[PDB]
Structure formats: C-alpha cells, structure tokens
Coordinates of N, CA and C in Angstrom, one line a residue:
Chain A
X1 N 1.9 -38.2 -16.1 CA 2.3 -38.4 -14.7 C 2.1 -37.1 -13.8
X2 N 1.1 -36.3 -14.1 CA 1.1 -35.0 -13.8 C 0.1 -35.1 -12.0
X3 N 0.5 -35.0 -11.3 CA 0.0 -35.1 -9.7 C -1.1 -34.0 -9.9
X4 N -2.6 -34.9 -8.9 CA -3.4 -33.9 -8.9 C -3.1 -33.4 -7.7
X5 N -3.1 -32.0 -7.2 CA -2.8 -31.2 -5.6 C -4.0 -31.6 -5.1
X6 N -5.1 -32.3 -5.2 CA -6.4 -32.7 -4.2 C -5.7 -33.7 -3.6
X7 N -4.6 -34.3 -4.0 CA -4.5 -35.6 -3.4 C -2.9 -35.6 -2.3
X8 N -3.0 -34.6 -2.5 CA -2.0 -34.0 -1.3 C -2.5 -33.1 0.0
X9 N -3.0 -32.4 -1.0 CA -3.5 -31.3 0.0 C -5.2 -31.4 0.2
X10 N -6.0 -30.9 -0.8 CA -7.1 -30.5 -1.1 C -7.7 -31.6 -1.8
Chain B
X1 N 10.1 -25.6 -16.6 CA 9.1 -24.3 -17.2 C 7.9 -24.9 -15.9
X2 N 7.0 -25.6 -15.6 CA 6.3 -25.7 -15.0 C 6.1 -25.6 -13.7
X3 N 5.4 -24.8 -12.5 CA 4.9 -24.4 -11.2 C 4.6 -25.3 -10.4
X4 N 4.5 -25.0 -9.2 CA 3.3 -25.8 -8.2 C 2.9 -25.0 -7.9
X5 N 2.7 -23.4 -8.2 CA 1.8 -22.6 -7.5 C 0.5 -22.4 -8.7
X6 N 0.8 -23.0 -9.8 CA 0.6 -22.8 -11.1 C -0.8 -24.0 -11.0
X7 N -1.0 -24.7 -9.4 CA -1.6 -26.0 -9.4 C -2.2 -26.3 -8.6
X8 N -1.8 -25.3 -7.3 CA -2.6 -24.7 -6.3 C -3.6 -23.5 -5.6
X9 N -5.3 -23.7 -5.8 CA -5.9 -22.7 -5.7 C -5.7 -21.7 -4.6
X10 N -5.6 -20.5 -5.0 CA -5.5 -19.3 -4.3 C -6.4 -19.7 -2.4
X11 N -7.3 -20.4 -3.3 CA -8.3 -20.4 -2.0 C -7.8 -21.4 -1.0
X12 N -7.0 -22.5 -1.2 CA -6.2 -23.2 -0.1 C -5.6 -22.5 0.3
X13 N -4.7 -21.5 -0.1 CA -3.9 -20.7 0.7 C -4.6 -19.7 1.6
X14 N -5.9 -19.3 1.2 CA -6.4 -18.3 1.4 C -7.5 -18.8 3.0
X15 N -7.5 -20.3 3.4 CA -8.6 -21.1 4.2 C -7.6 -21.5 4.6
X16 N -6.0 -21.4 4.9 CA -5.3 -21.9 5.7 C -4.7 -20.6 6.4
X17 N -4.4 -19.8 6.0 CA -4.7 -18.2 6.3 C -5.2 -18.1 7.5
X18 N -6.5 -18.5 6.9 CA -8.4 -18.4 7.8 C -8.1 -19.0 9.1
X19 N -7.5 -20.0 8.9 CA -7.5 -21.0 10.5 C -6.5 -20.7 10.6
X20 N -5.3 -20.2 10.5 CA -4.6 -19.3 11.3 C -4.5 -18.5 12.0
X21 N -4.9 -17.4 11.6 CA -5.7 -16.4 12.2 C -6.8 -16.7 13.0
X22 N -7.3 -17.1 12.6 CA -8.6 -18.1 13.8 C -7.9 -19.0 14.6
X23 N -7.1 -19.7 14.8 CA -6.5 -20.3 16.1 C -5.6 -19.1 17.1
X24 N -6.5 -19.8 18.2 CA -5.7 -18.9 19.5 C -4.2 -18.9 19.3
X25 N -4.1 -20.3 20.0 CA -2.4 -20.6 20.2 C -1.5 -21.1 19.2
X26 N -0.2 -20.5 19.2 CA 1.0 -20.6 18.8 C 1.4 -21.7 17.7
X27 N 0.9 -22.8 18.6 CA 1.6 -24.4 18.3 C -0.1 -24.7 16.9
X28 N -0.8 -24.6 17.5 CA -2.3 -24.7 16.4 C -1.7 -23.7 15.2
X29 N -1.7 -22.3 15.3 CA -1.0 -21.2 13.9 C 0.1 -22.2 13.4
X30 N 0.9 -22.7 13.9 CA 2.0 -23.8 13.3 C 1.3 -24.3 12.9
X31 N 0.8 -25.1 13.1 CA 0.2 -26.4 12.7 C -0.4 -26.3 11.6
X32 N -1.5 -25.1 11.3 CA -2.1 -25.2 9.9 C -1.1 -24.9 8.7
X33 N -0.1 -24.1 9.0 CA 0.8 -23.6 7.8 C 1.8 -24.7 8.1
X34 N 2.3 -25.6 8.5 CA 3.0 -26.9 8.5 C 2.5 -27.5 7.3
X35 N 1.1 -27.7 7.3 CA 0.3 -28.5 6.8 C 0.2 -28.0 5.4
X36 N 0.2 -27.0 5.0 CA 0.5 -26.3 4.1 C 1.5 -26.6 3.6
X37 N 2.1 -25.8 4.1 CA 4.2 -26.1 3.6 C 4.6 -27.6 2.5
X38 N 4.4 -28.6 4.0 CA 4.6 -30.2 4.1 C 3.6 -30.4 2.6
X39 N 2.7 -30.1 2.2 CA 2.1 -30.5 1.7 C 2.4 -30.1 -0.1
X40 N 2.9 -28.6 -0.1 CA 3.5 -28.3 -1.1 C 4.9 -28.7 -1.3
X41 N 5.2 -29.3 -0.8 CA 7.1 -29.6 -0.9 C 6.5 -31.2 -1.2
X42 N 5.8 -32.2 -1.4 CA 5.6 -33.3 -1.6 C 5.2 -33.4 -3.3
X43 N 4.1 -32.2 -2.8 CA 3.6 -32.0 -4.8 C 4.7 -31.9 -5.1
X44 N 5.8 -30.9 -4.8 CA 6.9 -30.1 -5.7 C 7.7 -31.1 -5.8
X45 N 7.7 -32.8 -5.1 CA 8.7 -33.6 -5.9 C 8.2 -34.6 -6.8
X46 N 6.8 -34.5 -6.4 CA 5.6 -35.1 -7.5 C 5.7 -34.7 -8.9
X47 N 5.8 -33.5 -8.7 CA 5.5 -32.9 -10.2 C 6.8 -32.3 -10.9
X48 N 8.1 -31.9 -10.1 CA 9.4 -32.0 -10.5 C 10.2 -33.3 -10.3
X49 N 9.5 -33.9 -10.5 CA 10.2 -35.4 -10.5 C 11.4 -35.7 -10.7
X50 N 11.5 -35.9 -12.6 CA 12.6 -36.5 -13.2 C 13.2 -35.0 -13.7
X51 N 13.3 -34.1 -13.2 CA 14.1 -33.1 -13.9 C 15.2 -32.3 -13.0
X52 N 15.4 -31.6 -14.0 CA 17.0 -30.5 -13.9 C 17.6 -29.9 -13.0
X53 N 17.3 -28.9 -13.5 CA 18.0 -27.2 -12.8 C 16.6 -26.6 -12.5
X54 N 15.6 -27.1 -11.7 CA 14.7 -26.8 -11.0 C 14.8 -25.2 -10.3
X55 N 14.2 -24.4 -10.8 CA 14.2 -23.4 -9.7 C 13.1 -23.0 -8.7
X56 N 11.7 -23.7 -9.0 CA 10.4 -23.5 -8.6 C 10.7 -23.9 -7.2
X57 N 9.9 -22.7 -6.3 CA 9.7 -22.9 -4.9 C 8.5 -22.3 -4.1
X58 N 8.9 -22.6 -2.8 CA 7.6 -21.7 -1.9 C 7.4 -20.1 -2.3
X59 N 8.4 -19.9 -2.8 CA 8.2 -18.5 -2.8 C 7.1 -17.5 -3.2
X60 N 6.2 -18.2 -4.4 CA 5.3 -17.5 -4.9 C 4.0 -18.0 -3.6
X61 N 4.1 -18.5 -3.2 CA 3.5 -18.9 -1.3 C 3.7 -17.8 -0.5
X62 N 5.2 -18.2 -0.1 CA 5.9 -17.2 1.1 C 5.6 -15.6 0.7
X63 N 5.5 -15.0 -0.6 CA 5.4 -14.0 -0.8 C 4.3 -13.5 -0.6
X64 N 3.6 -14.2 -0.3 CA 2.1 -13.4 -0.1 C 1.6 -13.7 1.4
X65 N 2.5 -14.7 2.3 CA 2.3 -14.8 3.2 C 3.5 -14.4 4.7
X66 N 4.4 -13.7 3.9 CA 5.0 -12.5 4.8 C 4.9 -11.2 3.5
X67 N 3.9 -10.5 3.0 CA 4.2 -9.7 2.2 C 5.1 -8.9 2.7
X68 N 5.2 -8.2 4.0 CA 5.5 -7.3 4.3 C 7.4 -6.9 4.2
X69 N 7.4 -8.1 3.4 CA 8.9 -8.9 3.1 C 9.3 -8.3 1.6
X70 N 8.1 -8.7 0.9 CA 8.1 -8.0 -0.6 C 8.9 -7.3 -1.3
X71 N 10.0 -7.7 -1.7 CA 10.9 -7.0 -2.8 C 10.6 -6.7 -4.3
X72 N 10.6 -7.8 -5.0 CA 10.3 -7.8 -6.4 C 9.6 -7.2 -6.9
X73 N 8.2 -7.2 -6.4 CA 7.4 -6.2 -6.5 C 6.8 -4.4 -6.1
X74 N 7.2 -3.5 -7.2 CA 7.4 -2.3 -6.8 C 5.5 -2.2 -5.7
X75 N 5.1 -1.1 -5.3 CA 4.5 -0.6 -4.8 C 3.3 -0.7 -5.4
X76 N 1.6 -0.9 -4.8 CA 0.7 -1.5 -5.8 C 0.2 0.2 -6.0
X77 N 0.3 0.7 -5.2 CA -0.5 2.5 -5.6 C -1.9 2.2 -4.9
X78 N -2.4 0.9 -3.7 CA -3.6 1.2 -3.8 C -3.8 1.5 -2.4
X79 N -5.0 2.6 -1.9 CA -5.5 2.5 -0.4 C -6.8 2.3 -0.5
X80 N -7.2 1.3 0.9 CA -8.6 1.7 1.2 C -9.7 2.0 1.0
X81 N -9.3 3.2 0.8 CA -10.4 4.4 0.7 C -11.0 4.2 -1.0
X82 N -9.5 3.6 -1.7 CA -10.4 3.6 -3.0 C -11.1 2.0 -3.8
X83 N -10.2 1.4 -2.8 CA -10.8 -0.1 -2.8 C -12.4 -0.3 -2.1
X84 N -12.8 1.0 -1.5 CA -14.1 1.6 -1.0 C -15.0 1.3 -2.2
X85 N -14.4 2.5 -2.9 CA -15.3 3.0 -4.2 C -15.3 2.1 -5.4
X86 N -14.4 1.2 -5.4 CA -14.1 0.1 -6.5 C -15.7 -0.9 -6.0
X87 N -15.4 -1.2 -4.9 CA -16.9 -2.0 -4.8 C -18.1 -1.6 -4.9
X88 N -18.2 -0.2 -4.4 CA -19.7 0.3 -4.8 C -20.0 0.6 -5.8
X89 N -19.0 0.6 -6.9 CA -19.4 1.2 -8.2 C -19.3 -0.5 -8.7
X90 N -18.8 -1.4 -8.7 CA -18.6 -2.7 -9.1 C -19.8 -3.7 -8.2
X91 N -20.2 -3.1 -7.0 CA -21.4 -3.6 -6.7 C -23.2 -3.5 -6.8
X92 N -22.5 -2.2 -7.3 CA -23.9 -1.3 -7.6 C -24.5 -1.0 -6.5
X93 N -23.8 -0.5 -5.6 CA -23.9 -0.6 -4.3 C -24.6 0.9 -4.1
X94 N -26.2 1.4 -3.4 CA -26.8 2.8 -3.2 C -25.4 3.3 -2.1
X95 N -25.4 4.7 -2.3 CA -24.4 5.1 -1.3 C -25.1 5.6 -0.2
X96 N -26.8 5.2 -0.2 CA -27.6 5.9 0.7 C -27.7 4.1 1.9
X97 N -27.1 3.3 1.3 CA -27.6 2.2 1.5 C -26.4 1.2 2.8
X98 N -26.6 0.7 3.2 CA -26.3 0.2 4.5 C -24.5 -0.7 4.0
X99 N -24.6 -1.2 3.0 CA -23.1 -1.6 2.9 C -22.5 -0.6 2.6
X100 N -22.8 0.0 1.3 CA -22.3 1.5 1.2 C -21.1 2.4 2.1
X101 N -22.2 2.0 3.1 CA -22.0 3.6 4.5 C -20.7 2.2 5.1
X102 N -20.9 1.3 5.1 CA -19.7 0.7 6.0 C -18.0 0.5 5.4
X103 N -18.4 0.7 3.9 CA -16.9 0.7 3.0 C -16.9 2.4 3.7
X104 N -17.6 3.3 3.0 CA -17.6 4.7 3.1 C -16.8 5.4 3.8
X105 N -17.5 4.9 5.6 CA -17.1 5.5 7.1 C -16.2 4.3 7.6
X106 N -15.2 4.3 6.9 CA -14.4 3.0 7.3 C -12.9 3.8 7.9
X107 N -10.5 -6.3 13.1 CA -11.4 -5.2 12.4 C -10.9 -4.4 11.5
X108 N -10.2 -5.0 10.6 CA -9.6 -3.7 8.9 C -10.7 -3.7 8.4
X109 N -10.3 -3.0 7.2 CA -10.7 -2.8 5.7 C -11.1 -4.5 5.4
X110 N -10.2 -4.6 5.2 CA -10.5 -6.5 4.7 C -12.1 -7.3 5.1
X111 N -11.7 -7.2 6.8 CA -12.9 -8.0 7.7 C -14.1 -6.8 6.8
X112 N -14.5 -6.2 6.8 CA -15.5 -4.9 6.5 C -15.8 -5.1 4.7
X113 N -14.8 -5.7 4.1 CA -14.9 -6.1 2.9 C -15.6 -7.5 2.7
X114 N -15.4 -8.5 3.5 CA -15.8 -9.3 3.8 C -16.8 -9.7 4.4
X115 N -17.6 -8.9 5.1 CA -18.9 -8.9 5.4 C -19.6 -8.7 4.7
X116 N -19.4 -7.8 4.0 CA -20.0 -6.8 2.4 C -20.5 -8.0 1.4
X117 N -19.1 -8.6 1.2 CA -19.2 -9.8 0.0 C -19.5 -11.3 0.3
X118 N -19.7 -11.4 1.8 CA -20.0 -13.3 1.9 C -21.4 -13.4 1.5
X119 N -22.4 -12.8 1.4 CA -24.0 -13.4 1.4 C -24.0 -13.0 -0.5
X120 N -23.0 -12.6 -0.8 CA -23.0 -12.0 -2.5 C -22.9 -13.2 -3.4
X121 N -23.4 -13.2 -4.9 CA -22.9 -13.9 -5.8 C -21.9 -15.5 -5.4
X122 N -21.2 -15.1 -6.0 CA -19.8 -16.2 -6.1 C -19.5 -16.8 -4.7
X123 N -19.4 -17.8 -4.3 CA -19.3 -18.6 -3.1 C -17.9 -19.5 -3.4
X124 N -17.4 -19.6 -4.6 CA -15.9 -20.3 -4.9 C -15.0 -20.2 -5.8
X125 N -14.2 -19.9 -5.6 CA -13.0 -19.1 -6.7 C -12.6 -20.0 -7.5
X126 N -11.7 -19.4 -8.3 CA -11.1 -20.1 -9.5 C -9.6 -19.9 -10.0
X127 N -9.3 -19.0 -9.3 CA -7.7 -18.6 -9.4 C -6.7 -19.3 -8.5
X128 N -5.7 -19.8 -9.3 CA -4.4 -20.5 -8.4 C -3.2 -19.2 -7.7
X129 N -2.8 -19.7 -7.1 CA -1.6 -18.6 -6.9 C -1.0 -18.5 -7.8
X130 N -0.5 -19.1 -8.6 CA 0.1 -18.4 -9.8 C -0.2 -17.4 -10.8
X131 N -1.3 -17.2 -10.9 CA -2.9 -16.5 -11.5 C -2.6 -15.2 -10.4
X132 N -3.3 -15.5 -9.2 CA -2.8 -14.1 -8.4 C -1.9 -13.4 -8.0
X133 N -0.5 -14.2 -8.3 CA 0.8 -13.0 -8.9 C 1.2 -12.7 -9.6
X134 N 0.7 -13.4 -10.9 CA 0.7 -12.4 -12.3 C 0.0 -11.3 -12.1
X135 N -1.3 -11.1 -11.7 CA -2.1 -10.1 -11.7 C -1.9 -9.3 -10.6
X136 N -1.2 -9.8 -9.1 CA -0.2 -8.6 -8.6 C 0.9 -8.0 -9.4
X137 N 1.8 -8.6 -9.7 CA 2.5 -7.9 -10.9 C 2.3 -7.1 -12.0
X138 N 1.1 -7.4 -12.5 CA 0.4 -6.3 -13.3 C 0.1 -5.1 -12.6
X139 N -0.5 -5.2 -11.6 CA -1.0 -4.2 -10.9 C 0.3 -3.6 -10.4
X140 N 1.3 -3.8 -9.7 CA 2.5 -3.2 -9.4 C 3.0 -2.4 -10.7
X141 N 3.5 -3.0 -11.9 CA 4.1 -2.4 -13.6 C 3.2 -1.1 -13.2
X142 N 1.7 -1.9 -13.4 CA 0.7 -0.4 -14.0 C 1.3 0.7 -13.2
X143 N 1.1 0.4 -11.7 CA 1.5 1.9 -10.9 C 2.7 2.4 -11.0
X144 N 3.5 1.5 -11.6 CA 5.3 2.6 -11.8 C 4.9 3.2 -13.2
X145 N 4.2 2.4 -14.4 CA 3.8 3.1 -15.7 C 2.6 4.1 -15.2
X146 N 2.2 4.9 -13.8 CA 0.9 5.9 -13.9 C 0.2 5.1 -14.5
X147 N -0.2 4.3 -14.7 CA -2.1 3.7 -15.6 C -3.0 3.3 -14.2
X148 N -3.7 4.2 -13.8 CA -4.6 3.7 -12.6 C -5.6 2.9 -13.4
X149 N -5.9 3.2 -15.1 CA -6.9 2.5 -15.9 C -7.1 1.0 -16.1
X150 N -5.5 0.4 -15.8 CA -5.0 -0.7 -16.7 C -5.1 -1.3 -14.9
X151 N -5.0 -0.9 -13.4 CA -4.9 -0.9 -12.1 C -6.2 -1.7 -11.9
X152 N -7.0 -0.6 -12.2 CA -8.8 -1.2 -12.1 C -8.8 -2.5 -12.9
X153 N -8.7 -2.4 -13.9 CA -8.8 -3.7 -14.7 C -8.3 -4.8 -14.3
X154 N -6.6 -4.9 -13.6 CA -6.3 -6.0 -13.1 C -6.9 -6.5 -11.8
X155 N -7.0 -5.1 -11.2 CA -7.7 -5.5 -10.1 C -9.1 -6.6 -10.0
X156 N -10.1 -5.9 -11.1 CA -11.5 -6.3 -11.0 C -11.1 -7.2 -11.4
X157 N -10.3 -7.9 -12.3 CA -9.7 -9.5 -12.8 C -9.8 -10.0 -11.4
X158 N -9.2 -9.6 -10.5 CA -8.9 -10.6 -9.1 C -10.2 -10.2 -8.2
X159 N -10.7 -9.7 -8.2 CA -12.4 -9.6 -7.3 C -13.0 -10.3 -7.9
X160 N -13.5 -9.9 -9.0 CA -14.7 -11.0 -9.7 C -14.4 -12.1 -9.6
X161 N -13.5 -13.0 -9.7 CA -13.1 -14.1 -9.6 C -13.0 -15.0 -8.9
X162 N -12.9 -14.4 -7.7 CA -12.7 -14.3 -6.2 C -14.0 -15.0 -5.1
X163 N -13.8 -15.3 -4.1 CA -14.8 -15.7 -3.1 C -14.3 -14.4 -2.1
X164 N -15.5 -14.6 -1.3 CA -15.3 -13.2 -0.2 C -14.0 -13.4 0.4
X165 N -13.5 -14.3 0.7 CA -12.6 -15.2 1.9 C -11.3 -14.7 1.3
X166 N -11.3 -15.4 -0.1 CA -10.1 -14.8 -0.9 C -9.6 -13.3 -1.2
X167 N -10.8 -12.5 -1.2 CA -10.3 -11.1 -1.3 C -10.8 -10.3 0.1
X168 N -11.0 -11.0 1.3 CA -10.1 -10.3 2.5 C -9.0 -10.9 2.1
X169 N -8.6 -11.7 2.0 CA -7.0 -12.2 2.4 C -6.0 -11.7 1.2
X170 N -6.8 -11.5 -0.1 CA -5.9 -10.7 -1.0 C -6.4 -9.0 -0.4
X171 N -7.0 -8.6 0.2 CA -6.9 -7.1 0.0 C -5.6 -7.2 1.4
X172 N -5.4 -7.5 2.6 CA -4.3 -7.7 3.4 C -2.7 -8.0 2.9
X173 N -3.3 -9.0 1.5 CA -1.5 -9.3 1.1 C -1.1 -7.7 0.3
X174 N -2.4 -7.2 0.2 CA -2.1 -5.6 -0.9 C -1.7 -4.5 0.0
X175 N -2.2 -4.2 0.9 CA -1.6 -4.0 2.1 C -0.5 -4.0 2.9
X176 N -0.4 -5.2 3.0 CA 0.8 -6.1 3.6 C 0.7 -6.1 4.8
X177 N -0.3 -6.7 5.7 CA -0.1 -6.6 7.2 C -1.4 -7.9 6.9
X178 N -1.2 -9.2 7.2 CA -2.2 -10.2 7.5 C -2.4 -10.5 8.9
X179 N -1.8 -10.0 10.0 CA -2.8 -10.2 11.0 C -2.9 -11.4 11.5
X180 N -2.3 -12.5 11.4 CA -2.0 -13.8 11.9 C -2.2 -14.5 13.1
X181 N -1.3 -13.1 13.7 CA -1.0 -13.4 15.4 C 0.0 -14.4 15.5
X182 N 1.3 -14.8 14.2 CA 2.2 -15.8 14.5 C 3.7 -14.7 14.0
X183 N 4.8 -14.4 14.6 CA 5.4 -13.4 14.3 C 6.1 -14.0 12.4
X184 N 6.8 -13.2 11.8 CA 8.0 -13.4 10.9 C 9.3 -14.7 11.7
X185 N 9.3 -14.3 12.7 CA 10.7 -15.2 12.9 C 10.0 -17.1 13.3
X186 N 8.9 -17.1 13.7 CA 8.3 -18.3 14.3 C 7.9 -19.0 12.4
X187 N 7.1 -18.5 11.3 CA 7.0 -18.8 10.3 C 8.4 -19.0 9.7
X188 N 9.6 -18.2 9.6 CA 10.8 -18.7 9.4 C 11.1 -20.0 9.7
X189 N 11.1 -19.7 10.9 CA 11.9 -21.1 11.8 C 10.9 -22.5 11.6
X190 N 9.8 -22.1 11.1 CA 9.0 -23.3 10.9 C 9.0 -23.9 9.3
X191 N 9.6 -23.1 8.6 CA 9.9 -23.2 7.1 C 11.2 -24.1 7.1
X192 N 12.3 -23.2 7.7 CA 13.7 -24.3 7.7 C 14.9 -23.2 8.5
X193 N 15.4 -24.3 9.6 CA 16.2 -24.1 10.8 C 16.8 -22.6 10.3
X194 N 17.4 -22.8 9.2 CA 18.0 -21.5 8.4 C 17.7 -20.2 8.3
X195 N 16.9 -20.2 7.9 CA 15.8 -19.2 7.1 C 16.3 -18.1 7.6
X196 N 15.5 -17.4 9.2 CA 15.6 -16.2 9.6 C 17.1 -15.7 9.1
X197 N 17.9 -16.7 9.4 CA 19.4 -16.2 8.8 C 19.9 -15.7 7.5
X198 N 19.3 -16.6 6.6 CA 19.2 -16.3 5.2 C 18.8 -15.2 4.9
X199 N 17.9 -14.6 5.0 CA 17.0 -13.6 4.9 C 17.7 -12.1 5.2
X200 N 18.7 -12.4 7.0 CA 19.1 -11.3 7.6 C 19.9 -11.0 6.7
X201 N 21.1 -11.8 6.0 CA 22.1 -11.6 5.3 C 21.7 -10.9 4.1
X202 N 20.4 -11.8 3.2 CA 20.6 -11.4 1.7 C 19.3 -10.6 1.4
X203 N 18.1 -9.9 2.7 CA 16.8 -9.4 2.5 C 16.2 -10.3 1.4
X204 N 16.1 -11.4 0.9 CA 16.0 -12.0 -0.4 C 15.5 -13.3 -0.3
X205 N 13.6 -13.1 -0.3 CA 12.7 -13.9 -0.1 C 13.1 -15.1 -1.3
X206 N 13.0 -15.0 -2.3 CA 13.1 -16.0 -3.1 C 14.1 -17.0 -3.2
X207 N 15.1 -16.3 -2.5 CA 16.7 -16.6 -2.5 C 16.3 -18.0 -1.6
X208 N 16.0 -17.1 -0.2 CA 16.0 -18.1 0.8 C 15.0 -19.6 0.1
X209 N 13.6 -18.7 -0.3 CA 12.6 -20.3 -0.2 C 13.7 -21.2 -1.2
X210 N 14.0 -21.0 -2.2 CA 14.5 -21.8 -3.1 C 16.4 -22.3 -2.8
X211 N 16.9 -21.3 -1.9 CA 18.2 -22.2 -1.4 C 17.6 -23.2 -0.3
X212 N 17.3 -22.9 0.8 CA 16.3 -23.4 1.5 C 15.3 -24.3 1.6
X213 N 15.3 -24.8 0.2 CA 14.0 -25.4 -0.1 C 13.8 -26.8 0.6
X214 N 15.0 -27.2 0.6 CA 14.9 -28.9 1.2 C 15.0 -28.5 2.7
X215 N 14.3 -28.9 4.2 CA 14.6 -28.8 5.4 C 15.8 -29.1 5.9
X216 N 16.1 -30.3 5.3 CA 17.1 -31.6 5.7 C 18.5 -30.8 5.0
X217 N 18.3 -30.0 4.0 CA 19.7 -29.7 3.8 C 19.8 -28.1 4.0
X218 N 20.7 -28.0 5.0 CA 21.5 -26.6 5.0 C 22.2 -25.6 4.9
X219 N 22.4 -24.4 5.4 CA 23.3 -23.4 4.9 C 24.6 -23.7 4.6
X220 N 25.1 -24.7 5.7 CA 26.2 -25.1 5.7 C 26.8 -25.9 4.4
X221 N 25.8 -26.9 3.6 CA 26.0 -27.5 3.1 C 25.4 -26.8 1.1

C-alpha cells in the first residue's frame, strides 16, 4: 500500500 | 521508521523553489509552496496511514527552505571561493578558460554556478531530500571533526548527482540565504496560523513542523 509521490505531487 | 522526505525528489523541492523565486507577486510565491506543503501532508497520511507515535514531518522540507533557521546542524565550514575551485578541478575546467574566470572573479555564487553547469552532462537528478540531509549532515560532523577530506567527498556525492537547478538551490541552502522574495513570517503563516509563534517561544524548527503538523489543529489544543 506504499503511495507513489507522482501521484500527489509529481 | 519510514519518511516522506525519504520519497520525495530533491528536484521537486528544488523547481518549486525555481517558480518562487521566479514569481513577481506575493500571493503567486504562496501559491507554489502551498502546493508543495498541501501536497506533502496528503502523502504523509498516505503513507503513515495505519500507524502510531508518528514523528515524521515537514521539517526535513522546512529545513532547507528557511535554512537560515538551522539549528541541528553545526556549521558546514564552506565558502564560495572554494566551492570555486571544487568545480574547476571537478570540471576540468582551463583556468585560462571562460567558465573558469567567472567562478574565479566572482546574481550570487549559485546563479554563476548555474550558468557554468546547465548546458553540462546530467540534465536530472536522483537524490530525494532525505539523501540531501544525510549528506548535509555529513558535511556539517566532518567540519566540527576538521576532515575538509571526508567535506569534499560528501560534497561531490551531492554535485555529481545533482542537475544544475538542484545545486544552485543546494549551494543557497549551504549558505543559507535563498532569495525568494517571500519573508520568514509570510512562509510561517502559510504553513499554520501558529507557527511564527511556535518558533518565537522555542527557536525549534522541528518542534514547530511536527507539533504543528495538522493546520486544523492548534497551539491551544
């Protein structure tokens, strides 16, 4: 379940 | 045990920076580091979901983006003048030769570094902010242990690595003056209602991002 930061941010 | 700075490249931080400094007005400087912020506080419940006694915060952020705040870390030992000579010897740079003469007879340091290195090699980094405060922190130890040897080494770890963009904005956080054009107290107040007050009382960046961490919840509470 580890969030990728592209899909927030970048 | 696990980060969000641990997840986020140096270089977002470092291209939000960019358009900060590059926006004229006030409300636009807000706006890109909002964006920023807002955006690391959503990962950070993403990826600290189901857990504990959480302590991970903006702070390994905020630290590099008010360095001039900087506690934790003792003094890096470095100037200018020799962050000069690190590139021409690391660039193989003629000293008879036109970049040379512009580290040399040295709008900072940074911008001048940055001219030097955008048409160079590497066009995209690979280091997260978590990665670039370990290797501040190295470089800080070295200089209270005297090793200018073990200094270079951490250092060229973070240039080589690096995109031009990233090491103007890392040679400014080594420094500690980024040049923004948005004061300390307006980045506070845009972080959480609290903040500037937190800070007055306890000088204690990390204290604040991580008591502070939720907007919605206060000093008071």
């Amino acid at each position: 379940d580890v969030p990728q930061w592209e899909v927030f941010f970048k | 045990s696990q980060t969000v700075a641990s997840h986020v490249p140096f270089a977002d931080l470092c291209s939000t920076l960019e358009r900060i400094q590059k926006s004229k007005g006030r409300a636009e400087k807000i706006r890109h580091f909002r964006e920023f912020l807002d955006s690391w506080r959503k990962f950070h419940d993403a990826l600290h979901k189901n857990h504990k006694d959480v302590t991970d915060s903006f702070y390994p952020a905020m630290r590099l983006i008010l360095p001039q705040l900087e506690r934790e870390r003792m003094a890096y030992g470095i100037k200018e003048t020799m962050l000069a000579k690190l590139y021409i010897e690391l660039l193989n740079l003629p000293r008879d030769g036109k970049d040379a003469l512009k580290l040399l007879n040295y709008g900072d340091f940074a911008m001048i570094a940055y001219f030097v290195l955008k048409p160079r090699c590497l066009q995209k980094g690979s280091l997260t902010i978590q990665q670039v405060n370990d290797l501040l922190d190295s470089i800080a130890s070295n200089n209270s242990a005297k090793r200018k040897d073990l200094i270079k080494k951490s250092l060229l770890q973070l240039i080589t690595q690096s995109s031009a963009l990233e090491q103007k904005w890392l040679i400014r956080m080594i420094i500690k003056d980024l040049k923004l054009g948005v004061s300390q107290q307006t980045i506070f107040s845009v972080f959480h209602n609290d903040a500037a007050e937190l800070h007055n009382v306890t000088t204690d960046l990390e204290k604040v991002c991580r008591q502070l961490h939720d907007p919605s919840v206060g000093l008071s509470d």
